[PDB]
Design a protein around this nucleic acid. Structure first.
Lengths: 49, 58, 839, 902, 126
RNA sequence: UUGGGCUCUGUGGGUGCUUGGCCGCUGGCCAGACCUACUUCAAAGCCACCGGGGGUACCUACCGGUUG
C-alpha cells in the first residue's frame, strides 16, 4: 500500500510547451505548436467578485 | 522441509503471481503468501493430482 | 497484409557502454546502444540504425576520417566494419583479445588498437566502395606492427596530426611515444611520472609539446629539452598542475589540438574545460549525479559530447554558447509498457523507474519527460483523441495528462490505498477503468468530474488485464481466477457475463471491428472469442511456438523450463487480421487471426550480455564453479564506488542497487502502428521499431507478361493513355516507376484518370498519395490528387469505411500535417500585413 | 569474368590434390599443417583443434604444384608450363604475398618440390634443379643431372637434406641411383647404387633420426637405409610390392615405442598411394613389422567414383602424433597411447570433406533473424552420398551429418580392409533436399537415442522434431534428417506407388513433408509422428487429378492452403490441401516438359524450368504466367531466385550462367565457366551465392558486388505550388528561435571562475561556425536587386543555418534612404518574386512571419515599402485563398468519411 | 510403456472419469456398452463427439468411463464431456500435436462445453 | 543382413565471425643469445562502507592548551 495522498502543490509558468520539453536541437512540435501558453485563459484571468 | 523446499524452487516449480521465481530470497510479503503456488508444467503438480485422484491429462 | 518486416530502426535507448563519435562533416553523431550503433543526424532531426548486430555489447567505435567507413568492436573483441553512406556491413574480424583502445589515423591508412596489454597497428582495408573493379577480399586486414613494450592495460591511444607518431597512455603510470615507421633521429620512448595511471595523452598542434592527463587529476605538459646540465636532449616535463576536483578522479579526458583546449569529466558527475597552454579554467558544470564515462569532441571543435554510462544521459553541450545541444535520457530500469499515438507520429513509453517519456519516431528523441510519479509506472494508454494520456503507476495514482498543454489535469486514487497494476480508458475520453492487485475490485472513475463512480466487482482474484472494446460498448476484464468477464457498463443495466477459461489470464485485446476479443492466457494459448454470441471461435496453443529459454541459473533444459511459455502481451493489427504477441521469452510471434497458423517468428535480440537470447548455453562457458556468468566480479574493480554492492537480498522488482549484470529479455510490450506498416516491441534491448520493407523487395500485384517499366514509359510518353499507364504502374507495384508516372501526368487529366480508375486499386493508391504528400515536395499537386479521389469515390469509401481504415488514417494525418504546417502561417501573415497596411 | 559476382572462396575442401602437405612446428606447442586447396594455400593449427588458421590471397592463375613451409613463410610453386599455363614461385606470409621469385627463363618443366635449408632454397622441377639464395632471394645457379637414357635422367624420387651435412642435397634418379650434390659449387660429389639391381626406381627417401642414415625406397619393393658416407647397407626391407610401391615414409623421433613393450625406439611409418592402408615397422631386432592402420583414408579405386589414396605421412617431431592426408579431401591425425601399448594408433583429430563433386546445394532458411542471419549453414548433398552442414562463418564448425555408426558397422563387417564399400554402406546419392527449421530444437531435441530410418509426442512436441527431408537416387524411401543433432532421423517414408522418389518439399510450419514420386503419387506425412496425413488425390472432379508422369516440383503455399504440383509432362495442378483435391490445373502439355520449380515466399511467386530451354514464371495468386525467359543453349542444370525477387539466376549445361532482372524481364548478367555448374543456390540475406561445379569436389562461393557497390549495368546482351527541400525542422527552429535557446540553456548555470579568461580561443571555421558554407549577404541581396534574379541570394538564404539566418535577417536595414539601398524593401521584393515564381511557399511564409516580427516598427514608419507590401498582400491573398480552400475542403471531408455517423 | 490417458469431465453433480488407452476400439460405461447406457432418447447427445470427429479417429483406442452422482441428464452431459476430453488428450500425448489442434478446432467450433466444464454459479443483476 | 542389447567410462570436434607459438617485441627466438648496466634532484591535495540503543577507567583519532 503506497501512502495516504499528501497534497502537493507544483507551480507552472506562463512560458510555452517548448519550455516544458527537454533539450534537443529542434522542437518536434509544429508551428502552431509553440504559441500556446501552457496555462489557460481561466488561469490568466476570470471575472469574479 | 525448508531444505527440500529450496531444492524445489531452485529447480523451479514455484510461481509467484504469474512469474516463475528463481531467487530464493524473494521476500514474500503478506499479500503474496496467498498467491505463491505451483507452476504450469510441473511434475510436482501432476504428482499431487495423482495422489488425490483427479489427475486431469488436460 | 503484406507481412515481411525487416529490421528497421532501434529507438528509445540512447547510449550504452561505449564510445561517442562525430562525422567529420561535423553534424552526425554516432553512438552505441546494446549491440547496434545509431546515428543521430543533428542538422535535420534524424536517426537511424545499422543493419548489423554484434553478439556482445559494443565497446569501441572508430571512424575513417574520410567519413565513409566505420569499425565497431564488441566486448570479447569481436569486430564488424561497415560502409556508412551505403549502409551495408562489410566485414567480420576477430581480435584475439577483449579490446580497450582504438583510433584511426587521420591519414586514413592505418589504425592502432590497444588490447589488454598488446598494442597493434593494422592497415586499413581496400574497400569495394573504393576500388573501381573491386571485390570482397577474404582476409581484409593485414597486420603491420605489434608492440609488447608495455606493462598493463593500454587505455588510450592517439595519433599525431602528421600521422607519423602516436601516443599510448597506459594504466601503469606510463606513456610511450611510438614511430609509425622507422624515423632517423628517433628512439621510441617512455614518459613517466604520475601518481595513478594516465587517461589521456596527446600531441600539440605544433607537435613539440605533449600533454598527459592522469587519473588523479594531474595534467603534465612535457617538452623535449636538454637535461639540466647544459646531442643530449630528453623528454621531460616543462610543468604540471592538477584539476582541483576535491573528491573523485576524472575518468574521461579529451582535448582539441587545433583550438588548444581541453575537457575533463570526473566521477562526481561534473566536468570542466580549460584553455590549455596557458591553463586557465574556461568553465565547468555538473551534468549528472552518477559520473562520466566518455568525452569526445567535435572535429571542428565547437561541440562537446558526453556519454554517461550508468543512465541514458547522453548530452551534447555547446560550451562557448553555454548551452545544451541536447540532453537525452534513455531509460535505466526496464519498460513495462508503451503505446503509439493516434497521431501515428510518435510513441509514448512508461518505464518502471518513475519517468514516463514521449519518444518521437523520426529523430530518435524523447521529446518530453514527465516525472510526476514517485514509483514504478505500469500501464499507459490513450483516449481516442490522442491528446489526453493516462498513466497508472504503483504509487496508487492514475494520473491523467493533457499533451497540448502539458499538465496532469487530473489524478485519481482508490479510497483504501491500492496499487494499480493495470488499466485502460474508455475510448470516449470520458471514463477510466482501473484494476489493482491488492483489492480485486475494478474501479471506474469519471474523467469529467473525477470523483469515483463505480467499483465493479465479481472477481475471484486480482484483475489482470483490462481493455475497452473500441466502440466503447464493452469493458473486458481478465483475472487470474481462471476467468474473463464481459462488463457491459453504459447500458442501463450495468450487466456482466462470465467466460470460463482454462487458466489465469494475462492479456486482452480487441479487434478494430469491435466484434472480436483475443485473450492470451497462462498455459500460453490464445483463445479468440466473438463478443456478442459469447462463444469461443478459435484457439492456438503456442507453447513450443514460443519457448526459448535457458537463462543463467535456469537449471531446467531450455525446453522444459517453466514460465517462458506464455504471451505476456498480445495486440491487434490495424487492418484487423493479424495478432502480434510477445512476452517473457526470446521470440515475438505473429499469428493469423482466422487461419490460426503462424505467420512469422522474430527473435528479439542477438545479444549475449542478456541471458535468454540463445537456447543452449555452452560447456566452455561452464566452469567447475557453476557458470562463469555468476562470479561476483565486483572485487576486481578500480573504483570504490564500483567495489561496493549496495544491493538488496532478493528483490526481483524495483531495487535500487541494480546488480543488473546479465538480466533477462522480456518482451514487455508490443504495439502495432495506427498507420499499419510498422510496429514496435518494448524490450530490455530498448525499444525496437520494425517496419515492413517495401522498396527492397519487388512485389507484383497481379501482373501480365507485357508490362515492363519500359512498356509503361512508352505508353506514358508516346501513347499518353495515362489511366492505362497508371494502372499498369500500380499493377507492377514498384516505387520509382510509380513515382515517375505520378509526377508525369498533367494536372488537368487528373480528374479524368481518377474518374476512370478502378476501385480495387484505389486504396493502395490513397496510401501512395499519402506518402507523396508527406515527403515529396509537390504539395499542391498531391492535394489536387486527394481532392479528386475523395470527390469521385465518397460513397464507396463511406460504404466500406473499415476496409480502408489505415488508408483513411494516413491521409487524415497527412492533410493535418499540411494544415497545421502552412495555413496557420498564411492566415497569420495576411492578418499581420493587413493590420500594418491599415496602420 | 562476371559483372556481378566475384569468386570469394572455394569453400568445402581441405586436400583434393595429391600434393604433399607441409608442417612447421612452432613454439614448444603448436604445429602448422598446411595444405593446398588447389588454388591457394591453407594453414591449420594443430593445438587449437584443426581450425582454419590461414588462407592465401590472391589465388594463383594455375594449379599449385608445390608448396613448402619455412620460418613463417610459405613458398608456393604453381603452374604447368608444358600446357599453356604460366608458372612461378611466390612467397606468402599470413596469406598475402610478400614476395615473388625470379625464375629461369628456360624452364619448361613443371616444378615438383621446394626445399629450404642452410640459407638456400632448392627447386626440383622435373629433371633440373634450380637454387636461390634465400637471404636476398636471388637465383644462384641451376643444376643438371646427366644420364645415358632419357628414362634414366628423370628426377624422380626427390631431393632432401642430410641433417648435419654441409650444403649437400640428395637427389634420386629414375634409374635406381642416388646422387649426392654439393650445392655450393654446383658439383655432383657422390653417386650410390642399390643392392640387387632388379629394384627399379627410387620412390621416396627421408633422413632418419639417426646420424648419417637415410631411407631410400625403390619402386621395385625394397626400402633400404644406408650410411650415406660409408655406402654400406644398414637395413633392407622387402617393404612394397611391384604393384604397390612405398611412396612416402616418416620416422618417429620420440624415444619409445618398440620392442613389444613400447619402451624402445625405432618405429617408422610407410605409405603407398595404391592403397589407403599405412604400415608401422619396429626396427629393433632386424626390422620386424608391427602393424597396419588399415584404411586410414578411403582405399583408392579406378573403377569407383570414390576418390582414395594417401598423399603424405609425417610423424611430427618429438610427439607421438602422426599426421596423414590423402586424396579424398581428408586430413586426419592419429596418436599412440602409452599405458595400453598400441600397435596401431587411434584418431585424435579429423577433418573431412567430400569424395565426389557436390550434387545438390541448399542454404538453410533463416534462424529467424538471430545468430545465423541466413548465411551460416550451407547444406551440401554429395555424390559420395553424404550430407554436410557447412559453416560459412567458422570453417571448423562444419560437420558431416552422421547416418549412425557407419564406420563401426563397417569395421565389424569387413569393408575396411578388402561385399561392398563404405560409401555403398551409406545411404544412396542424394537427389534433392528440402528443409525447414520451425521445429528443429537444436541438440537435446528427443533425449535418449532414437532409431534410424525405421519405415511418443509430449516430449517431441515440447522440443522439436525432424527438419530436413531428402530424396535419394533410386530408393523409393525418402529420408529425414535431424538438423539440431546433425544426425539422421527416424522417419523414412515410402511413396505409396513404390516408384522412386523424384522430389520432396516441406511445409512452412515444418510439420508436413510431402514426397513426390515418379509414378505420380504425391503423399504427405506429418513429420513429428511419422504418419500419413493426405494422399493426392484422396478419396473439377474429386478423386481424379492423378498425375500420369513424374511429379517434380511441388511446393507448399506458406499458409498450408494450396499445394502446387508440377508434373514432368504437361501440367501444374494447384490442390486444395486440406481437402486433398484438385482445384485448378494449367496445361503446357503439347510443347514443353517441366523439370523443376523454385518458389519465392512473401511474393507468391513460382518459377518453372521446362525442357524447351525455357523458364516460365507464374504468380500463383493469379494463376497466369507472368514471364518466360529465353536464354538457354544447354540443358538447364540449376536455377534459383534471389530473395529480393529482383534476380532469377540459372546455369544450363552450356557452362554459362545467366541472370535476368525479373521485374524488368531483362538480361543483366551472363558469364562462362571452366566447368558447367551443377548446383547453384542463394543465401537468404541477399549476400552470398553458392555454386558447385562438375568434376572438382567442393563448392565455389561468390559475393554480391551489386549489394556492396552500385553497378549501373542494364546491358541486355547475347553472348503549381511546390515547396523546397529544406529540412522542415530547419525552418521550424528558424521560426521559433528564441524559446528553444531559452530551454537549451541549462537550469543551473555553469560555474565560471571570478577571473574569466577573456578572449576565448578561436573556434569553428575562421572565428565562425563550421556549418555556414564558404564562398556580404547584404551585397548578395543588393546585387540581386540591382539585377532582378534574386535566386542566388535566395538559395543562399536556404543555405544558411538557423542562427546565422536569424542573425542575418535581424541585421537588415534601410541604409541611406535611397531606393536601391534598403535590405528591407529588396527582401520584400525577393519574397514577392519567389511567390510569383511559385517556388518556396513554405520558406516564404516562414521568412515573412519572422521578418515582420522583427521589423514591424520601421516598416510602419515607412510606406515606400508598403506599396510593394500591398502587392505582396494581393498575391498572398490569391494563393492562400486557393490553397486553404483546397486543404480545408479535403481535410474536412476526410474527417467526415472517418466519422460519418454522428 | 502401456499408454494411458486419464481424463475428467463434470457437470452439476455428475463426475466422469474416463481412461483412454490403446486397444481394439470398444467404448464402455461402468461395465456396459454405449448405445445401451442412457435415457434412450439422449444417445445422440452421447454420440455427438464421435460424430463430429469421425470414427476413423476413434478406431485406435478404448474408452472406459465411470460415472456417478446426480440425475440422468447430468450423467449424460458428463459422459459426452469425458469422451471428448479423452480423445483429444490422447491425441495430444501419443500422436501429432497438429492433429490435436485441428481436432480441438473441430470440437470447440461445434460447441464449447465439450471441452470445458464451464459451470453455473449464481450472479443476478446487481 | 554372417551375433544382438542395456548401462557405464574415457578421448576429439562442436555447443558465439576462421589472422600464428614465445620474448626483455618496428626485432629476434623457437638448439636460443647478452645477462647488471644507467642515473639528476622523494613526494600536490581530498575521499575512501564494520548492524542499533548503551558505558567509558585505559588505548587511539581529533580539538584546545602547558613546560622543555
Amino acid at each position: 500500500k503506497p501512502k495516504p495522498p499528501a497534497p502537493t502543490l507544483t507551480v507552472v509558468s506562463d512560458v510555452a510547451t517548448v519550455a516544458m520539453e527537454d533539450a534537443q536541437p529542434a522542437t518536434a512540435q509544429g508551428v502552431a505548436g509553440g504559441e500556446t501558453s501552457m496555462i489557460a485563459p481561466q488561469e490568466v484571468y476570470a471575472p469574479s467578485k | 522441509t525448508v531444505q527440500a523446499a529450496t531444492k524445489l524452487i531452485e529447480q523451479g516449480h514455484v510461481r509467484v503471481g504469474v512469474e516463475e521465481v528463481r531467487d530464493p530470497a524473494f521476500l514474500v510479503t503478506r499479500n503474496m503468501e496467498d498467491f505463491v503456488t505451483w507452476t504450469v508444467g510441473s511434475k510436482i503438480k501432476q504428482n499431487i493430482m495423482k495422489y488425490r485422484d483427479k489427475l486431469d491429462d488436460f | 497484409m503484406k507481412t515481411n518486416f525487416k529490421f528497421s530502426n532501434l529507438l528509445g535507448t540512447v547510449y550504452c557502454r561505449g564510445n561517442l563519435l562525430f562525422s567529420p562533416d561535423g553534424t552526425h553523431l554516432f553512438s552505441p546502444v546494446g549491440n547496434r550503433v545509431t546515428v543521430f543526424n543533428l542538422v535535420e532531426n534524424k536517426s537511424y540504425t545499422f543493419p548489423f548486430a554484434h553478439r556482445k555489447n559494443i565497446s569501441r567505435i572508430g571512424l575513417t576520417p574520410q567519413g565513409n567507413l566505420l569499425l565497431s568492436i564488441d566486448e570479447d573483441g569481436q569486430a564488424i566494419l561497415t560502409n556508412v553512406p551505403r549502409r551495408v556491413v562489410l566485414y567480420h574480424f576477430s581480435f584475439k583479445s577483449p579490446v580497450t583502445a582504438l583510433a584511426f589515423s587521420p591519414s586514413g591508412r592505418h589504425f592502432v588498437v590497444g588490447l589488454k596489454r598488446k598494442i597493434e597497428v593494422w592497415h586499413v582495408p581496400s574497400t569495394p566502395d573504393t576500388n573501381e573493379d573491386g571485390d570482397l577480399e577474404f582476409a581484409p586486414f593485414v597486420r603491420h606492427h605489434t608492440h609488447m613494450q608495455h606493462f598493463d592495460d593500454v587505455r588510450h591511444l592517439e595519433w599525431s596530426s602528421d600521422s607519423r607518431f602516436f601516443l599510448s597512455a597506459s594504466k601503469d603510470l606510463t606513456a610511450r611515444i611510438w614511430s609509425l615507421d622507422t624515423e632517423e633521429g628517433f628512439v621510441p620512448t617512455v614518459l613517466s611520472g604520475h601518481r595513478q595511471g594516465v587517461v589521456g595523452a596527446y600531441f600539440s598542434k605544433d607537435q613539440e609539446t605533449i600533454y598527459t592527463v592522469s587519473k588523479d587529476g594531474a595534467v603534465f605538459e612535457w617538452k623535449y629539452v636538454a637535461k639540466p646540465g647544459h646531442e643530449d636532449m630528453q623528454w621531460r616535463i616543462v610543468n604540471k598542475h592538477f584539476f582541483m576536483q576535491n573528491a573523485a578522479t576524472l575518468r574521461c579526458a579529451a582535448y582539441h589540438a587545433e583550438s588548444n583546449l581541453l575537457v575533463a569529466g570526473f566521477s562526481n558527475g561534473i566536468f570542466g574545460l580549460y584553455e590549455m597552454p596557458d591553463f586557465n579554467l574556461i568553465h565547468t558544470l555538473s551534468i549528472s549525479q552518477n559520473e562520466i564515462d566518455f568525452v569526445t569532441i567535435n572535429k571542428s571543435g565547437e561541440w562537446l559530447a558526453f556519454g554517461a554510462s550508468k543512465l541514458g544521459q547522453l548530452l551534447v553541450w555547446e560550451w562557448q554558447s553555454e548551452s545544451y545541444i541536447l540532453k537525452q535520457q534513455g531509460h535505466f530500469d526496464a519498460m513495462n509498457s508503451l503505446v503509439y499515438s493516434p497521431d501515428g507520429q510518435r510513441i509514448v513509453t512508461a518505464a518502471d523507474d518513475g519517468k514516463i517519456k514521449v519518444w518521437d519516431v523520426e529523430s530518435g528523441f524523447c521529446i518530453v519527460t514527465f516525472t510526476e510519479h514517485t514509483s514504478g509506472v505500469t500501464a499507459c494508454e490513450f483516449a481516442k483523441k490522442g491528446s489526453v494520456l493516462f498513466t497508472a503507476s504503483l504509487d496508487g495514482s492514475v494520473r491523467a495528462w493533457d499533451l497540448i498543454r502539458y499538465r496532469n489535469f487530473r489524478t485519481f486514487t482508490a479510497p483504501e490505498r491500492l496499487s494499480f497494476t493495470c488499466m485502460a480508458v474508455d475510448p470516449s475520453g470520458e471514463v477510466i477503468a482501473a484494476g489493482s492487485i491488492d483489492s480485486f475490485d475494478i474501479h471506474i472513475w469519471s474523467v469529467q468530474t473525477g470523483q469515483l463512480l463505480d467499483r465493479l466487482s465479481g472477481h475471484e482474484g486480482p484483475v489482470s488485464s483490462l481493455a475497452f472494446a473500441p466502440d466503447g460498448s464493452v469493458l473486458v476484464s481478465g483475472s487470474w481466477d481462471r476467468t474473463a468477464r464481459i462488463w457491459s457498463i453504459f447500458s442501463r443495466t450495468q450487466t456482466s457475463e462470465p467466460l470460463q477459461l482454462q487458466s489465469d489470464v494475462l492479456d486482452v485485446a480487441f479487434r478494430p471491428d469491435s466484434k472480436q476479443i483475443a485473450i492470451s492466457t497462462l498455459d500460453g494459448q490464445l483463445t479468440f472469442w466473438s463478443v456478442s454470441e459469447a462463444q469461443q471461435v478459435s484457439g492456438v496453443d503456442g507453447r513450443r511456438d514460443v519457448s526459448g529459454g535457458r537463462r543463467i541459473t535456469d537449471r531446467r533444459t531450455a525446453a522444459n523450463v517453466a514460465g517462458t511459455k506464455n504471451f505476456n502481451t498480445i495486440r491487434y493489427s490495424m487492418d484487423g487480421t493479424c495478432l502480434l504477441a510477445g512476452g517473457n521469452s526470446k521470440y515475438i510471434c505473429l499469428y493469423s487471426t482466422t487461419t490460426m497458423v503462424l505467420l512469422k517468428k522474430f527473435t528479439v535480440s542477438v545479444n549475449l550480455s542478456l541471458s535468454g537470447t540463445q537456447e543452449f548455453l555452452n560447456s566452455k562457458l561452464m566452469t567447475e564453479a557453476g557458470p562463469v556468468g555468476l562470479l561476483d566480479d565486483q572485487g576486481e574493480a578500480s573504483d570504490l564506488e564500483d567495489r561496493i554492492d549496495r544491493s538488496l537480498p532478493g528483490s526481483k522488482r524495483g531495487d535500487p542497487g541494480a546488480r543488473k549484470k546479465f538480466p533477462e529479455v522480456r518482451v514487455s510490450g508490443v504495439a502495432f502502428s495506427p498507420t499499419g506498416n510498422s510496429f514496435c516491441a518494448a524490450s530490455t534491448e530498448g525499444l525496437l521499431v520494425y517496419s515492413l520493407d517495401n522498396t527492397v523487395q519487388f512485389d507484383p500485384f497481379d501482373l501480365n507478361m507485357e508490362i515492363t517499366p519500359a512498356s509503361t514509359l512508352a505508353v506514358l510518353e508516346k501513347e499518353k493513355d495515362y489511366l492505362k499507364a497508371l494502372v499498369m504502374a500500380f499493377r507492377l507495384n514498384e516505387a520509382g516507376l510509380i513515382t515517375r508516372v505520378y509526377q508525369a501526368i498533367p494536372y488537368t487529366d487528373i480528374g479524368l484518370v481518377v474518374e476512370q480508375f478502378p476501385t480495387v486499386y484505389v486504396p493502395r493508391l490513397l496510401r501512395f498519395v499519402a506518402a507523396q504528400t508527406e515527403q515529396s515536395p509537390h504539395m499542391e499537386f498531391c492535394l489536387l490528387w486527394i481532392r479528386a479521389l475523395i470527390d469521385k469515390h465518397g460513397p464507396w469509401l463511406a460504404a466500406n469505411r473499415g476496409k480502408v481504415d489505415v488508408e483513411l488514417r494516413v491521409v487524415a494525418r497527412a492533410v493535418a500535417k499540411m494544415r497545421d504546417e502552412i495555413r496557420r502561417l498564411a492566415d497569420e501573415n495576411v492578418y499581420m500585413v493587413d493590420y500594418l497596411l491599415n496602420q | 569474368g562476371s559483372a556481378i559476382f566475384a569468386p570469394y572462396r572455394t569453400i568445402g575442401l581441405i586436400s583434393p590434390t595429391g600434393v604433399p602437405f607441409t608442417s612447421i612446428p612452432l613454439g614448444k606447442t603448436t604445429f602448422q599443417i598446411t595444405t593446398s586447396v588447389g588454388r591457394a594455400l591453407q594453414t591449420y593449427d594443430l593445438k587449437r583443434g584443426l581450425n582454419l588458421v590461414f588462407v592465401t590471397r590472391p589465388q594463383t592463375p594455375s594449379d599449385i604444384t608445390a608448396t613448402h613451409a619455412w620460418k613463417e613463410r610459405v613458398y608456393a610453386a604453381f603452374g604447368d608450363p608444358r600446357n599453356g599455363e604460366p608458372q612461378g614461385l611466390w612467397v606468402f606470409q599470413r596469406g598475402k604475398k610478400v614476395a615473388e621469385l625470379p625464375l629461369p627463363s628456360d624452364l619448361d618443366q613443371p616444378i615438383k618440390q621446394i626445399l629450404i635449408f642452410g640459407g638456400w632454397i632448392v627447386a626440383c622441377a622435373l629433371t633440373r634443379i634450380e637454387v636461390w639464395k634465400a637471404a636476398t632471394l636471388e637465383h644462384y645457379t641451376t643444376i643438371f643431372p646427366a644420364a645415358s637414357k632419357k628414362g634414366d635422367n628423370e628426377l624422380t624420387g626427390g631431393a632432401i637434406n642430410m641433417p648435419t651435412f654441409l650444403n649437400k642435397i640428395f637427389v634420386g634418379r629414375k634409374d635406381g641411383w642416388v646422387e649426392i650434390w654439393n650445392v655450393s659449387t654446383g658439383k655432383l660429389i657422390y653417386t650410390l647404387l642399390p643392392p640387387s639391381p632388379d629394384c627399379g626406381a627410387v620412390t621416396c627417401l627421408q633422413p632418419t633420426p639417426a646420424l648419417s642414415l637415410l631411407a631410400i625406397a625403390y619402386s621395385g619393393g625394397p626400402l633400404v637405409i644406408q650410411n650415406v658416407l660409408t655406402d654400406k647397407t644398414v637395413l633392407l626391407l622387402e617393404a612394397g610390392t611391384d604393384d604397390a610401391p612405398v611412396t612416402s615414409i616418416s620416422f618417429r623421433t620420440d624415444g619409445l615405442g618398440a620392442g613389444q613393450d613400447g619402451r624402445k625406439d625405432g618405429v617408422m611409418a610407410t605409405a603407398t598411394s595404391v592403397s589407403g592402408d599405412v604400415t608401422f615397422w619396429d626396427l629393433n631386432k632386424g626390422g620386424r613389422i608391427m602393424g597396419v592402420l588399415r584404411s586410414a583414408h578411403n582405399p583408392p579405386s579406378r573403377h569407383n567414383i570414390v576418390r582414395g589414396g594417401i598423399s603424405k605421412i609425417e610423424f611430427l617431431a618429438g610427439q607421438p602424433v602422426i599426421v596423414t592426408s590423402g586424396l579424398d579431401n581428408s586430413l586426419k591425425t592419429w596418436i599412440f597411447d602409452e599405458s595400453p601399448f598400441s600397435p596401431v594408433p587411434r584418431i585424435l583429430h579429423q577433418r573431412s570433406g567430400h569424395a565426389a563433386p557436390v550434387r545438390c546445394l541448399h542454404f538453410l532458411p533463416s534462424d529467424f533473424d538471430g545468430a545465423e542471419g541466413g548465411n551460416k549453414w550451407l547444406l551440401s548433398g554429395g555424390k559420395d552420398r553424404s550430407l554436410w552442414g557447412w559453416s560459412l562463418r567458422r570453417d571448423g564448425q562444419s560437420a558431416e551429418l552422421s547416418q549412425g555408426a557407419i564406420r563401426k558397422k563397417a569395421r565389424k563387417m569387413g569393408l575396411l580392409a578388402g561385399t561392398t564399400t563404405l560409401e555403398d554402406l551409406k545411404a544412396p546419392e542424394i537427389t534433392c533436399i528440402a528443409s525447414s527449421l520451425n521445429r528443429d530444437g537444436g541438440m537435446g531435441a528427443i533425449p535418449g537415442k532414437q532409431m534410424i530410418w525405421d519405415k511418443n509426442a509430449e516430449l517431441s512436441g515440447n522440443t522439436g522434431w525432424e527438419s530436413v527431408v531428402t530424396a535419394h537416387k533410386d530408393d523409393p524411401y525418402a529420408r529425414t534428417w535431424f538438423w539440431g543433432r546433425r544426425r539422421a532421423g527416424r522417419w523414412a517414408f515410402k511413396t505409396g506407388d513404390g516408384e522412386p522418389v523424384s522430389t520432396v518439399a516441406i511445409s512452412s510450419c515444418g510439420t508436413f513433408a510431402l514426397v513426390g514420386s515418379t509414378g505420380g503419387s504425391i503423399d504427405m506425412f506429418n513429420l513429428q509422428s511419422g504418419r500419413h496425413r493426405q494422399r493426392f488425390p484422396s478419396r473439377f472432379a474429386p478423386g481424379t487429378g492423378r498425375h500420369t508422369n513424374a511429379v517434380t516440383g511441388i511446393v507448399v503455399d506458406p499458409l498450408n492452403r494450396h499445394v502446387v504440383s508440377c508434373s514432368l509432362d504437361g501440367k501444374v495442378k494447384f490442390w486444395d490441401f486440406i481437402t486433398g483435391n484438385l482445384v485448378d490445373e494449367i496445361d503446357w502439355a503439347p510443347m514443353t516438359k517441366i523439370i523443376g520449380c523454385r518458389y519465392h515466399p512473401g511474393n507468391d511467386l513460382i518459377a518453372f524450368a521446362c525442357d524447351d530451354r525455357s523458364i516460365r514464371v507464374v504468380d500463383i495468386e493469379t494463376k497466369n504466367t507472368i514471364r518466360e525467359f529465353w536464354g538457354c543453349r544447354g540443358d538447364i542444370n540449376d536455377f534459383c531466385f534471389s530473395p529480393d525477387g529482383r534476380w532469377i539466376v540459372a546455369a544450363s549445361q552450356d557452362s554459362i550462367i545467366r541472370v535476368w532482372d525479373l521485374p524488368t524481364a531483362h538480361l543483366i548478367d551472363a558469364f562462362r565457366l571452366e566447368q558447367p555448374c551443377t548446383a547453384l543456390a542463394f543465401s537468404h540475406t541477399g549476400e552470398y551465392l553458392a555454386g558447385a561445379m562438375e568434376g572438382s569436389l567442393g563448392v565455389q562461393i561468390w559475393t554480391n558486388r551489386t549489394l556492396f557497390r552500385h553497378v549501373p549495368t542494364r546491358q541486355i546482351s547475347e553472348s503549381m505550388m511546390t515547396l523546397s527541400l529544406v529540412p522542415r525542422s530547419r525552418w521550424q527552429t528558424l521560426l521559433h528561435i528564441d524559446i528553444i535557446k531559452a530551454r537549451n540553456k541549462p537550469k543551473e548555470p555553469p560555474k565560471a571562475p571570478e577571473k574569466a579568461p577573456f578572449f576565448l580561443p578561436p573556434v569553428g571555421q575562421n572565428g565562425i561556425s563550421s556549418l555556414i558554407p564558404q564562398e556580404t549577404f547584404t551585397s548578395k541581396l543588393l546585387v540581386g536587386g540591382a539585377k532582378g534574379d534574386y535566386t542566388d541570394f535566395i538559395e543562399h538564404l536556404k543555405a544558411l543555418p538557423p542562427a546565422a539566418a536569424d542573425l542575418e535577417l535581424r541585421s537588415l536595414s534601410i541604409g541611406n534612404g535611397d531606393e536601391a539601398t534598403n535590405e528591407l524593401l529588396h527582401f520584400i521584393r525577393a519574397l514577392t518574386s519567389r511567390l510569383v515564381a511559385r517556388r518556396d511557399y513554405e520558406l516564404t511564409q516562414a521568412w515573412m512571419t519572422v521578418f515582420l516580427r522583427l521589423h514591424f516598427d520601421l516598416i510602419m514608419e515607412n510606406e515606400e515599402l508598403l506599396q510593394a507590401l500591398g502587392e505582396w498582400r494581393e498575391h498572398q491573398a490569391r494563393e492562400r485563398d486557393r490553397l486553404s480552400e483546397l486543404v480545408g475542403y479535403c481535410g474536412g471531408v476526410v474527417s467526415f468519411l472517418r466519422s460519418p455517423r454522428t | 510403456s502401456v499408454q494411458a490417458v486419464q481424463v475428467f469431465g463434470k457437470k452439476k453433480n455428475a463426475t466422469a472419469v474416463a481412461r483412454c488407452v490403446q486397444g481394439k476400439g470398444l467404448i464402455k460405461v461402468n461395465g456396459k456398452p454405449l448405445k445401451l447406457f442412457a435415457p434412450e432418447i439422449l444417445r445422440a447427445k452421447l454420440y455427438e463427439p464421435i460424430l463430429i470427429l469421425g470414427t476413423d479417429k476413434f478406431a485406435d483406442v478404448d474408452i472406459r468411463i465411470r460415472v456417478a452422482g446426480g440425475g440422468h441428464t447430468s450423467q449424460v452431459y458428463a459422459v459426452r464431456q469425458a469422451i471428448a476430453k479423452s480423445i483429444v488428450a490422447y491425441y495430444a500425448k501419443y500422436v501429432d500435436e497438429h492433429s490435436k489442434n485441428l481436432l480441438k478446432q473441430e470440437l470447440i467450433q461445434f460447441d464449447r462445453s465439450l471441452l470445458v466444464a464451464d459451470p453455473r454459479r449464481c450472479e443476478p443483476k446487481k
